[PDB]
Design a binder for this molecule. Structure first.
Ligand SMILES: CC[C@H](O)[C@@H](C)[C@H]1O[C@@H]1C[C@H](C)/C=C/C=C(\C)[C@H]1OC(=O)C[C@H](O)CC[C@@](C)(O)[C@@H](OC(C)=O)/C=C/[C@@H]1C
Ligand SMILES: [Zn+2]
Ligand SMILES: [Zn+2]
Ligand SMILES: [Zn+2]
Lengths: 65, 400, 396, 842, 93
C-alpha cells in the first residue's frame, strides 16, 4: 500500500490528503470527456487550454505546506 | 417497486478522437472516431464527398486515447484503444462481417480514469514494433508487437517504464529508421515542489522533454535522454524520420513551436503568428489545439490549428541530416477542432471540439500564392502578423 | 471571457484611435478596411478577453420560424443564469419575464461582486420586452421559479420567497439553512424541491400563515446535481455532473410538518454522459409516458418503466447473459461501468440488450434457449419497448 | 552470516570458512572475499539476501573491476553441478554487472565467449536462451568493433564446429546491435577472397540471423539478400548449398510478406534447378519451396509450372533428405492460392501417390508424419474424395502399419472437409476398408478408433444401412476378452451413440444396452469406466422407456459401483447416476435415492476436480427429484455428529440443496439449528451460511431480511469466531447480491459490522475488512467514505491507524469514484482547499 | 511459514494448477465460480518453474482462475499471484 500513490497513514497531514484528492480530481477531469466539456463550456476556453491549466495545477494545486 | 429500462435514441454526436488509415485493408482510407462512450468507423467518399457511418459500437467505457498502427509490410491498420479499464485492447475491423474483432486485450491495472493507472496516453512506434500506454503520473508500460507465421498480430509482456513523482503532459512516438523504438514525452517532477514551504520550488520547475528507448536486443526500457524546456508545452508532433525527413519531435508551446531533435541537432524555435489587430486582450497567450500530419514519398508537412481556429501549414527545410528552419504559413481558418485528419486524394476532416463537424476538399496545397511565409531564422523582437481571410485553400464538401 | 457588442465596438474604435497615433497617412485607409469589416464570428471565432468579463443577451424568438422577436443586450460584466415567465397574484393577467443576473462573476477562484434580477413586461402577446425594474441582490441568483402567485428566487445558499413591487421585488421570505449553493429549483403545487450544487436535493415546505420556509427533508448522499424533474408528489429524478441519473423518493407516510426526513434512493444508474435535461413526456400519440433525457455530448436517451415483474426478470436475465457472452469491447466490466459512482439499482441497460442482434448466431441460440425462447422472439420483445415508448413505423 | 554450503560449493567458496580479519590480511586484489560473500549470497540464499547482495554488487561493480568479477564468476557458470535456477541467477548478475562496466569488459571479451558460446548449442532450450542473453549484453557493453575484432579470427577456422558456433554468436550480436550495425561486416566477409570458409561462415551468419530474428528481418531483408545472393554461383558447392539454405531461411522468416527482396534471386535458383544435383539441388529446391508461398497467384502458376518437372523427377530420388525436402515443397506449393487444384490433379497427384505411398514410408516415423500431413494439406485444396479414393483400397493391406497410415490420413481429411464430397462407391469402400482394418487389430490402435468414430459421425444419417453390420462387429469385438478391446469397443459405442439415435435404430442400441449392462461386474477398472461411459452415452439419446435395461433394474446395479476406488469409474458412474436423476427422475425409491445421496456425499472431498463437479451436479439432480425436506434433516443431523473433520462436505451439500431447490425451503431449518445453546453448532450454522450465500450468489437477494436477526445477535459479540464467520457471511452476501438493489438491508448490517472494526485477532479483523470491501462494492464507496471520515483525523493515533487502513482499502478500489464524494473542506490562509471547477453552474 | 505474493507485473504467461489445487482461487482459496484467467510474471514462469502450480509449485494439470468474488473486487488487477516463500531458496522444493 505504501507504493500506491494517494495512500495515507496516521501521520498524514490535511494538506497531503487534499493535494492527493485535488490531483485525483484533476486527472478525473482529464479522463471523463463530458466533465471536461462542462468545464470548457463554463469558462469560455477550448478543451486543450482547459487541460493545459489542469496540468499546470498539478505542480501545487493548493499551496506550500 | 419501480424498475427502469434505459435506451438510446440519438447516439452521442460530439467527437473526442479521430484517426485515419486503411482499416478496411484496401486502398480506401477510413476514419475511426471516438465519441467518448461509442467507437465509430466512418468512410468519406472521394466521389460524392460525403461521410457515411460504416459502423457504430457501444464500448460501455470511457475512451481516453485512440491510436492506429501497422506492422512492417502490412496492408491493414489496427486500432489500439486506451480506455478507463485497466486493460489495453488492439482491434481489427472486418469488412466481411462489419465488426471490430478484439485481437488482443492485456490487463495491467484497475478500472476508472485513475491518476497512476495507464490509459490516458497512448503512443505507438511509427514502424509498428511497439506500443506505449501511460498514465498521467508515474506508471508507463510498453508492449512489443510482432506477428507470427500466420501473419496474425501478437503482443508481448509489458515492460515497465515507471518514474515516481513524474507528470506526463503528452507522449509521442519518435520516427526512427528501424532503430530502437523511441518514445518522447513531456515530464514534470513535483518532488521538490512538494517539499518547500516557500513555494519557490513550484516556480522555476520547468518540464523536461525526455526520450525513452526500448532496447529490443536487451528487452528493457531506459530513460535514455532528458532535457528541460524553456516554457511549458501542451503537445508534441511526430516528425517523420528514417528515409523520409529527419527524425525528431515538434514541441508546441504557448506562443512558440520548437523542433528539438536530440543529438547534435540545435533547438529551432519559431513564434506563433498572431492575427493583425487582435481584438483579444494582449495579455492572453496563444497555443495550438490540435495538429494533423501528412507524409508523402516526396515531401511532408503539418497542419497546426490555434485557439482562434487558425490552421497553419508548417514545413521544415532540411540540409544533410539536420533541420535548418521551421517554415510556417497561414493555411486557412475552421472552427476549433479536437482532431484533424489529412487523407489522400485531397480531403481534410475537421472534427470540431463542439458543434457540427466538417469535411473539406484540399484545392491548393497553400503555396504558389503571394501570402507571407514565416521562417524561424527571421529576426524579430514583436511577433509575426497576418490577415485572416475567407476560405481560399479549402472547400466545404460535407457537414455532419 | 466575452465582450458585449457595445464593448467590442468601443475597443475597436479605441484601437483605431491608438492605430492612428503612429506617424505614418495610410492609417485612415487601414482604419477604413479595419472598421468597415467586422469578421463573421461564427467561423473566424468570437473575440474573447478578460478573466472577469462576460456577455449576456435576452432573446424572444418564435419557434415556428427562425425570427427573433425581441433582443435585449445586457451590460458588459452582467451574466444571466436563470429566467422564467409567469404571472403574479397581485397583478392581472400580465406576463412578466424575470431574469437572474450576476455582476462581476469570477470563477477559479469563485468570487462574485453582486447580482441582479431584471423584470420585464412582455407586451404585444410575447413579442417585445419592456423594462420594468432591476432589483439588485448580493449573491448570484441562479434559480427562479413561479410559486403560488409569487416567485421563488435562490440567491446563493438563500432560498427566498419574492413578491412584485412597483419599484423593486420585495423579499417576503428567506431560508438560509441550505448547505452550499442553489443550482435549480422546481415546485409542485405545494412543496419546494431545491437542487444544492453539491448536497443533492432538499425538500422545503412553505407555511402560508407566517411566510416560513421549513426544511422537512434532505438526501442521505451528496449529489452534484445538474438538473431534475418531479415524477410525482413524492419522487424526484435527478441528473449528475459526473453523468449519473437517480430517482429519490420520500417515505410513503410523511407530512411536511415533521423534520429531518431522510429521502431514500430508489434508483441509481451511471449513463456515462453528463445529463442536462430530464423530462417526463410522451414521444408519440397513443404511446406511454417515458423519461426522456438529453446529454452534454449531443445524445438523446430515454428511461422506460416496466409493466410487470415477468418482463423485469426477462430483460434482467438478458443483461446477465450478454454481460458474459458479449463483454464490452474495451475490456470494461459492464456492471462496474454502470456502477461507476453508485451501484446500479433497478435499471436494465437496453443498449447492451439490443446488442443481442449483433452476437453470433450460436450465441443467440444459446442465450435464447436459456430463456426458453428463440432469437427472433427475443428481438421482437426488444423491439416492443421502442414500439410502446419510442418510434416504430412498421405497418404490418 | 553465511547460508548453507553444498559439497560442490566448497571448490568455489572455501576461503569463507576460516575467519580472518579482512583489514589485517588485505593484499590488494585479495578483497575477493567481499565479492565472494555477495556471490555466495546470490547462489545460495533467500530472496532478500539475493536482492541485497545483487544491488551491493551492482553499485560497487565499477570499484571491483571486471577482472575479479569474471575470474570468479565463470568457474561457477562452468561447474557441472550447477542447477538451472542458479545458472539463471548467475546470468542476471552477469547482465547487471555488464551494464555498469561499459568499456572495462573489452580486454576480457574473448575470455567470456570461450566459456559462453557452448551454451548456444546445449540441449537445454533455456540454457541457449541464457547464452544468447549474456552474449547480447556483452555485445552492448563492449563495442561492435570489439566483438568483431574478437570473433573475426575464428571465421576461417578449419574446424566446422568453431565456424558454426562463431556464426551463431555473430547472429546473436546481430540481434543485440541490430542488423544495420553488422551489415557491412557481412557484406565484406561474404565476398572474402582469402578463403571459402570465411564466405561460408558469413552466409551461415545470414541464415542464423534469419532463424533467430524471425519476422523482425522484413525491413533489412533486401539488404541481407543482396549481400548474400552471389553465393549461388560460387565454384564451391558448400557455399552454394549454405547460400540456398540461408535464402530458404530468410523466406521462412519473412512469410508471408517480402517477395520483392528475393527478386534478384528468382532466376539464378531456377537456372540452378537444371544444372545441379545432390544436396545442393536439395538446398535450391528447399529455397524454392519456402519462396513460392510468398508469391502472387499468376507468378506462382508460372514458377510452379517452371519447377514441377524437376520436382517430379526428384520424387523418386534414393536420398531420404531429398524425399523429405521435395515432400515439404509439394505441401508448400499445393498450399499456395495461385496453384489451381486442376493442375495438381493433372500433373502432381499420379506420381505423388505412385512414388511416395509405399510400404517402406510407413515404417519411418518422420516419413509417416511428413506424408500424412502433406496428404491432408493436399485434401484441403484438391478435395476430400479426390485424395481419399486413391488410398481407400490400401485400408485392406496385410501390413497393419500401412493401414494405420491411410486410416489416420482419411481420418484427418474427413475430419477437416467432411462427407459431402463422397459419392456412394467411395462410401461403401470406406465402410468396407474401415470394418476390415478394424477387425484384424494386433493391438489397440487409437488411430483406428478415431478413424471409425470420425467417419461414422461424418457420414451421419448416411450410415443407417450399415448399422446392423457395424453393431455386430462391435459386439464380436466387445467379447474378444482382450480387456483393452472391450474398453476400445465401449469407447466406440460412446462416440457413435448420438449418430445411432439419428438413424432410427433404437432397438440395436437396445441390444448394445443389455450387452453393456451385463458387464458391470468387470474387474479391470479402465474397461469398466469405458463401459459406464457407453451406457451414459446411450441413455442420453434413448428414451427412458426404450432402455432395454430398465432404470428400475439399472440404477440399483449402479449404486454399489459408487464405492469403486478408480477415478474413471467414479466419474463415469456418478455421471450416469446424474443422467438418470435429471431425466429418469422417478423409477427408484425415495429411500433408494437417499441412500445414493449419502453414498455420494464424501465424494465432494474427492482429490480430482472432475469427480467433484460430477458429484455436485448429480447431487443437485437427486436433490431436485427428492425434495429438500427429508434430505435436509439428515444433513442437519450430520452437521453435529462428526464435526469439524467431515462437516465441510455436508456444508457443500446444504448449499447444493439450497441452490437446486429454493433456499426458502432450507433456510428456516438452518435458523432452527442456531437456537440450541451449544456453541460449536452455532459456528456450524454460521460457516454453512457463509458458504450458502457465497454459493447461491444472486439468489440471496430475496433472503437477506430473513437472516438479518441471526447476523444481528451472532454479529454482536457472543464469541470471537461468531463475529469472524458472521462478518464472512456479510462479505459473501454483499458480493453475491451486488447490483440487485439491497442497499437498505446491507447498509443496516453495516451498523453492526462497524463496532467490530477495532479488534486485534488477525483472522476476525481480516474477515471484518473483507466484509467492509464487499459492502464497499455492493453499497458504494460513498457510504463507506462517510463512515470512514470521522476517524481519519481523530485525535487518537490507534484510531487513525485503523480508519486510515479502511480508507486505504476504499481508496485502492474505486479511486476514480471518490472524486464525487470528497466533502467540501474550506481553504485556510496558506492554501486553497476548494475545488472550484465542480462549483461551476451553467 | 512466511509466504507472500509475487506482485510483479504479470505478462502473457498463463498460471497453472496441479491436480490437488485444481479448483482453488490463488488469493482466497475459494472453489466457487472460477472466473478470470490468471496471468503471471515472466520470472515466476521460467525454466524449471514453467507450467508449475501457482499455489504449491507442483506439476500443473489445468489453468488457474481468480474466483468471481476476486474479479468483482478487482483482485485480479493486482500483481502476479504466485506464492513464494521468503525462506526457501530457488533450489529448494
Ligand atoms: C467451505 C468452502 C470451501 O471452498 C470448501 C468447499 C473446501 O474445503 C473443501 C475441499 C474440497 C476438496 C473442495 C471442494 C470443492 C467443490 C465441490 C467445488 O467444485 C469444484 O471446484 C469443481 C468444479 O471446478 C466446479 C463445479 C461447479 C460448477 O459445480 C461449482 O459450482 C459453483 C456454482 O461454483 C461448484 C463448486 C464446488 C464448491
Ligand atoms: Zn497445487
Ligand atoms: Zn511473479
Ligand atoms: Zn478469490
Amino acid at each position: 500500500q505504501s507504493k500506491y500513490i494517494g495512500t495515507g497513514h496516521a501521520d498524514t497531514t490535511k494538506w497531503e490528503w487534499l493535494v492527493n484528492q485535488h490531483r485525483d480530481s484533476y486527472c478525473s477531469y482529464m479522463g471523463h470527456f463530458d466533465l471536461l466539456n462542462y468545464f470548457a463550456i463554463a469558462e469560455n476556453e477550448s478543451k486543450a487550454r482547459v487541460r493545459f491549466n489542469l496540468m499546470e495545477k498539478m505542480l501545487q494545486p493548493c499551496g506550500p505546506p | 417497486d419501480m424498475f427502469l429500462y434505459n435506451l438510446t435514441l440519438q447516439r452521442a454526436t460530439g467527437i473526442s478522437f479521430a484517426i485515419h488509415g486503411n482499416f478496411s485493408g484496401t486502398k480506401q482510407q477510413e476514419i475511426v472516431v471516438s465519441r467518448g462512450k461509442i467507437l465509430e468507423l466512418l468512410r468519406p467518399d472521394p466521389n460524392t464527398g460525403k461521410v457515411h457511418t460504416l459502423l457504430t459500437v457501444e464500448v460501455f467505457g470511457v475512451i481516453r486515447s485512440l491510436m492506429a498502427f501497422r506492422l512492417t509490410g502490412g496492408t491493414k491498420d489496427y486500432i489500439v484503444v486506451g480506455s478507463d479499464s485497466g486493460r489495453i485492447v488492439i482491434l481489427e475491423y472486418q469488412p466481411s462481417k462489419n465488426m471490430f474483432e478484439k485481437i488482443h486485450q492485456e490487463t495491467f491495472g484497475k478500472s476508472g480514469c485513475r491518476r497512476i493507472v495507464p490509459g490516458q496516453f497512448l503512443a505507438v512506434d511509427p514502424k509498428g514494433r511497439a506500443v506505449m500506454i501511460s498514465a498521467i503520473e508515474k506508471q508507463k508500460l510498453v508492449y512489443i508487437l510482432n506477428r507470427d507465421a500466420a501473419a496474425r498480430l501478437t503482443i508481448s509482456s509489458p515492460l515497465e517504464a515507471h518514474k515516481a513523482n513524474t507528470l506526463v503532459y503528452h507522449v509521442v512516438g519518435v520516427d526512427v529508421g528501424f532503430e530502437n523504438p523511441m518514445f518522447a514525452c513531456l515530464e514534470m517532477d513535483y518532488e521538490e515542489a512538494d517539499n518547500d514551504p516557500t513555494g519557490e520550488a513550484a516556480a522555476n520547475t520547468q518540464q523536461t522533454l525526455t526520450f525513452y528507448e526500448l532496447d529490443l536486443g536487451l528487452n528493457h526500457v531506459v530513460r535514455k535522454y532528458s532535457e528541460p524546456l524553456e516554457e511549458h508545452g501542451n503537445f508534441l508532433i511526430t516528425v517523420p524520420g528514417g528515409s523520409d525527413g529527419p527524425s525528431g519531435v515538434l514541441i508546441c508551446s504557448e506562443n512558440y513551436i520548437t523542433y528539438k531533435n536530440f543529438g547534435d541537432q540545435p533547438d529551432i524555435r519559431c513564434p506563433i503568428p498572431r492575427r493583425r489587430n487582435d481584438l483579444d486582450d494582449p495579455e492572453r497567450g496563444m497555443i495550438f489545439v490540435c495538429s494533423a500530419t501528412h507524409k508523402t514519398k516526396s515531401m511532408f508537412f503539418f497542419l497546426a490549428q490555434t485557439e482562434q481556429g487558425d490552421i497553419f501549414k508548417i514545413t521544415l527545410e532540411t540540409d544533410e541530416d539536420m533541420v535548418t528552419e521551421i517554415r510556417l504559413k497561414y493555411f486557412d481558418t475552421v472552427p476549433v477542432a479536437a482532431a484533424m485528419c489529412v487523407l489522400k486524394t485531397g480531403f481534410l476532416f475537421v472534427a470540431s471540439e463542439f458543434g457540427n463537424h466538417y469535411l473539406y476538399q484540399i484545392a491548393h496545397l497553400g503555396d504558389d500564392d503571394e501570402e507571407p511565409e514565416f521562417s524561424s531564422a527571421m529576426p524579430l523582437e514583436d511577433t509575426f502578423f497576418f490577415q485572416p481571410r475567407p476560405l481560399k485553400n479549402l472547400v466545404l464538401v460535407d457537414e455532419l | 471571457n466575452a465582450y458585449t457588442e457595445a464593448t467590442k465596438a468601443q475597443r475597436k474604435q479605441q484601437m483605431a484611435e491608438e492605430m492612428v497615433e503612429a506617424a505614418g497617412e495610410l492609417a485612415a485607409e487601414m482604419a477604413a478596411a479595419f472598421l468597415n469589416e467586422n469578421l463573421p464570428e461564427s467561423i473566424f471565432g468570437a473575440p474573447k478577453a478578460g478573466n472577469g468579463q462576460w456577455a449576456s443577451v435576452i432573446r424572444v424568438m418564435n419557434p415556428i420560424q427562425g425570427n427573433t422577436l425581441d433582443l435585449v443586450q445586457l451590460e458588459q460584466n452582467e451574466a444571466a443564469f436563470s429566467v422564467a415567465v409567469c404571472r403574479f397574484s397581485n397583478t392581472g393577467e400580465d406576463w412578466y419575464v424575470l431574469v437572474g443576473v450576476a455582476k462581476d462573476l469570477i470563477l477559479n477562484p469563485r468570487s462574485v461582486a453582486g447580482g441582479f434580477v431584471y423584470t420585464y413586461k412582455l407586451v404585444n402577446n410575447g413579442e417585445k420586452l419592456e423594462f420594468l425594474h432591476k432589483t439588485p441582490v448580493e449573491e448570484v441568483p441562479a434559480a427562479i421559479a413561479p410559486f403560488q402567485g409569487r416567485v421563488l428566487i435562490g440567491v446563493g445558499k438563500l432560498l427566498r420567497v419574492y413578491d412584485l413591487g412597483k419599484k423593486k421585488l420585495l423579499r417576503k421570505c428567506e431560508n438560509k439553512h441550505i448547505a452550499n449553493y442553489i443550482s435549480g429549483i422546481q415546485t409542485i403545487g405545494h412543496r419546494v424541491i431545491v437542487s444544492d450544487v453539491q448536497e443533492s436535493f432538499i425538500w422545503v415546505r412553505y407555511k402560508r400563515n407566517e411566510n416560513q420556509l421549513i426544511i422537512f427533508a434532505d438526501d442521505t448522499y451528496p449529489r452534484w446535481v445538474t438538473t431534475a424533474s418531479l415524477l410525482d408528489y413524492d419522487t424526484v429524478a435527478g441528473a449528475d455532473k459526473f453523468g449519473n441519473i437517480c430517482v429519490v423518493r420520500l417515505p410513503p407516510n410523511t407530512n411536511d410538518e415533521v423534520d429531518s426526513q431522510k429521502a431514500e434512493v430508489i434508483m441509481n444508474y451511471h449513463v456515462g454522459e453528463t445529463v442536462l435535461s430530464l423530462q417526463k413526456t410522451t414521444l408519440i400519440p397513443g404511446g406511454s409516458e417515458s423519461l426522456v433525457y438529453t446529454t452534454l455530448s449531443g445524445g438523446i436517451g430515454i428511461l422506460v418503466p416496466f409493466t410487470s415483474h415477468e418482463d423485469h426478470d426477462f430483460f434482467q436475465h438478458v443483461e446477465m447473459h450478454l454481460r458474459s457472452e458479449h463483454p464490452p469491447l474495451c475490456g470494461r466490466d459492464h456492471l462496474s461501468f454502470r456502477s461507476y459512482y453508485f451501484p446500479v439499482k433497478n435499471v436494465i441497460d437496453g443498449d447492451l440488450c439490443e446488442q443481442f442482434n449483433s452476437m453470433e448466431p450460436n450465441k443467440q441460440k444459446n442465450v435464447s434457449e436459456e430463456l426458453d425462447r428463440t432469437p427472433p422472439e427475443v428481438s421482437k420483445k426488444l423491439e416492443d419497448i421502442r414500439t410502446r415508448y419510442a418510434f416504430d413505423y412498421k405497418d404490418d | 552470516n553465511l547460508p548453507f554450503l553444498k559439497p560442490d560449493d566448497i571448490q568455489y567458496f572455501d576461503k569463507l570458512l576460516v575467519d580472518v580479519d579482512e583489514s589485517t590480511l588485505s593484499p590488494e586484489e585479495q578483497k575477493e572475499r567481499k565479492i565472494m560473500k555477495l556471490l555466495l549470497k546470490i547462489k545460495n540464499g533467500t530472496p532478500p539476501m539475493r536482492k541485497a547482495a545483487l544491488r551491493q554488487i551492482t553499485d560497487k561493480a565499477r570499484e571491483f573491476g571486471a577482472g575479479p568479477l569474471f575470474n570468479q564468476i565463470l568457474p561457477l557458470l562452468m561447474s557441472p553441478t550447477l542447477e538451472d535456477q542458479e545458472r539463471h541467477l548467475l546470468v542476471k548478475v552477469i547482465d547487471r554487472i555488464l551494464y555498469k562496466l561499459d568499456d572495462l569488459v573489452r580486454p576480457y571479451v574473448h575470455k567470456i565467449l570461450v566459456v559462453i558460446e557452448p551454451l548456444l548449442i546445449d540441449e537445454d532450450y533455456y540454457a541457449r536462451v541464457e547464452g544468447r542473453e549474456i552474449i547480447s549484453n556483452l555485445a552492448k557493453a563492449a563495442g561492435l568493433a570489439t566483438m568483431i575484432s574478437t570473433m573475426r579470427p575464428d571465421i576461417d577456422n578449419m574446424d566446422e564446429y568453431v565456424r558454426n558456433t562463431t556464426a551463431r554468436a555473430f547472429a546473436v550480436v546481430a540481434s543485440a546491435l541490430g542488423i544495420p550495425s553488422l551489415l557491412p561486416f557481412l557484406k565484406a566477409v561474404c565476398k572474402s577472397k582469402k578463403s571459402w570458409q570465411a564466405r561460408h561462415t558469413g552466409i551461415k551468419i545470414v541464415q542464423q540471423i534469419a532463424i533467430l530474428m524471425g519476422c523482425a528481418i522484413l525491413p533489412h531483408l533486401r539488404s541481407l539478400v543482396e549481400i548474400i545472393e552471389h553465393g549461388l554461383v560460387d565454384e564451391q558447392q558448400k557455399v552454394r548449398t549454405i547460400s540456398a539454405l540461408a535464402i530458404a531461411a530468410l523466406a521462412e522468416a519473412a512469410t508471408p510478406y517480402g517477395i520483392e527482396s528475393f527478386d534478384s534471386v528468382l532466376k539464378p535458383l531456377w537456372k540452378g534447378i537444371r544444372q545441379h544435383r545432390g544436396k545442393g539441388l536439395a538446398a535450391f529446391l528447399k529455397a524454392i519451396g519456402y519462396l513460392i508461398p510468398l508469391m502472387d497467384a499468376e507468378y506462382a502458376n508460372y514458377y510452379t509450372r517452371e519447377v514441377m518437372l524437376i520436382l517430379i523427377r526428384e520424387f523418386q530420388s534414393p536420398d531420404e533428405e531429398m524425399k523429405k525436402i521435395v515432400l515439404k515443397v509439394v505441401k508448400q506449393c499445393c498450399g499456395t492460392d495461385g496453384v489451381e487444384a486442376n493442375y495438381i490433379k493433372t500433373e502432381i497427384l499420379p506420381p505423388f501417390f505412385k512414388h511416395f505411398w509405399q510400404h517402406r514410408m510407413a515404417l519411418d516415423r518422420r516419413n509417416y508424419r511428413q506424408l500424412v500431413d502433406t496428404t491432408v494439406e493436399l485434401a484441403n485444396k484438391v478435395g476430400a474424395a479426390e485424395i481419399i479414393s486413391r488410398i481407400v483400397d490400401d485400408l485392406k493391406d496385410e501390413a497393419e502399419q500401412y493401414r494405420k497410415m491411410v486410416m489416420e490420413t482419411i481420418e484427418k481429411i474427413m475430419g477437416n472437409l467432411g462427407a459431402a464430397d463422397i459419392d456412394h462407391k467411395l462410401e461403401e469402400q470406406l465402410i468396407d476398408g474401415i470394418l476390415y482394418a478394424f477387425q484384424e487389430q494386433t493391438t489397440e490402435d487409437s488411430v483406428m478408433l478415431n478413424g471409425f468414430g470420425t467417419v461414422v459421425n461424418a457420414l451421419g444419417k448416411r450410415v443407417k444401412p450399415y448399422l446392423p453390420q457395424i453393431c455386430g462387429t462391435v459386439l464380436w469385438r466387445l467379447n474378444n476378452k482382450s480387456a483393452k478391446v472391450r474398453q476400445q469397443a465401449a469407447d466406440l459405442i460412446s462416440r457413435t451413440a448420438v449418430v445411432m439415435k439419428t438413424c432410427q435404430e433404437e432397438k440395436l442400441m437396445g441390444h448394445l444396452g443389455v450387452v453393456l449392462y451385463e458387464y458391470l461386474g468387470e474387474e479391470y477398472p479402465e474397461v469398466l469406466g469405458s463401459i459406464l461411459g457407453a451406457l451414459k452415452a446411450i441413455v442420453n439419446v434413448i428414451g427412458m422407456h426404450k432402455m432395454t435395461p430398465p432404470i428400475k433394474d439399472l440404477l440399483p446395479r449402479l449404486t454399489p459401483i459408487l464405492k469403486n476406488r478408480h477415478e474413471k469409474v467414479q466419474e463415469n458412474c456418478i455421471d450416469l447416476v446424474g443422467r438418470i436423476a435429471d431425466r429418469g427422475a422417478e423409477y427408484v425409491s425415495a429411500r433408494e435415492w437417499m441412500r445414493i445421496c449419502f453414498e455420494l456425499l464424501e465424494l465432494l472431498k474427492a482429490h480430482k476436480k472432475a469427480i467433484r463437479r460430477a458429484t455436485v451436479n448429480t447431487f443437485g439432480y437427486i436433490a431436485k427429484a427428492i425434495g429438500p425436506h427429508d434430505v435436509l434433516a439428515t444433513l442437519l443431523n450430520n452437521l453435529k455428529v462428526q464435526e469439524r473433520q467431515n462437516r465441510v462436505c455436508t456444508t457443500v451439500a446444504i448449499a447444493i440443496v439450497a441452490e437446486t431447490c429454493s433456499p426458502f425451503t432450507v433456510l428456516p431449518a438452518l435458523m432452527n439449528e442456531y437456537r440450541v445453546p451449544e456453541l460449536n453448532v452455532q459456528n456450524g450454522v454460521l460457516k454453512s451460511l457463509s458458504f450458502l450465500f457465497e454459493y447461491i450468489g444472486e439468489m440471496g437477494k430475496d433472503y437477506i431480511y430473513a437472516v438479518t436477526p441471526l447476523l444481528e445477535d451472532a454479529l454482536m459479540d457472543r464469541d470471537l469466531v461468531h463475529r469472524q464467520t458472521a462478518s464472512a457471511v456479510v462479505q459473501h452476501m454483499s458480493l453475491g447480491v451486488y447490483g440487485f438493489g439491497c442497499e437498505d438491508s446491507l447498509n443496516h448490517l453495516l451498523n453492526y459490522v462497524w463496532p467490530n472494526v477495532f479488534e486485534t485477532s488477525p483472522h476476525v479483523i481480516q474477515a471484518v475488512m473483507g466484509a467492509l470491501e464487499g459492502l464497499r462494492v455492493a453499497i458504494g464507496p460513498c457510504r463507506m467514505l462517510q463512515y470512514c471520515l470521522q476517524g481519519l483525523f481523530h485525535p487518537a493515533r490507534k484510531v487513525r491507524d485503523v480508519y486510515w487502513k479502511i480508507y486505504n482499502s476504499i481508496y485502492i478500489g474505486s479511486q476514480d469514484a471518490l472524486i464525487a464524494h470528497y466533502p467540501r473542506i474550506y481553504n485556510d490562509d496558506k492554501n486553497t482547499y476548494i475545488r472550484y471547477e465542480l462549483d461551476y453552474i451553467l | 511459514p512466511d509466504l507472500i505474493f509475487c506482485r510483479k507485473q504479470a505478462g502473457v504467461a498463463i498460471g497453472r494448477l496441479c491436480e490437488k489445487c485444481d479448483g482453488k482461487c490463488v488469493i482466497c482459496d475459494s472453489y466457487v465460480r472460477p472466473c478470470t484467467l490468471v496471468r503471471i510474471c515472466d520470472e515466476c514462469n521460467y525454466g524449471s518453474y514453467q507450467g508449475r502450480c501457482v499455489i504449491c509449485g507442483g506439476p500443473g494439470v489445468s489453468d488457474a482462475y481468480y474466483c468471481k468474488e476476486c474479479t468483482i473486487q478487482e483482485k485480479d488487477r493486482d500483481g502476479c499471484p504466485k506464492i513464494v516463500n521468503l525462506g526457501s531458496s530457488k533450489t529448494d522444493l
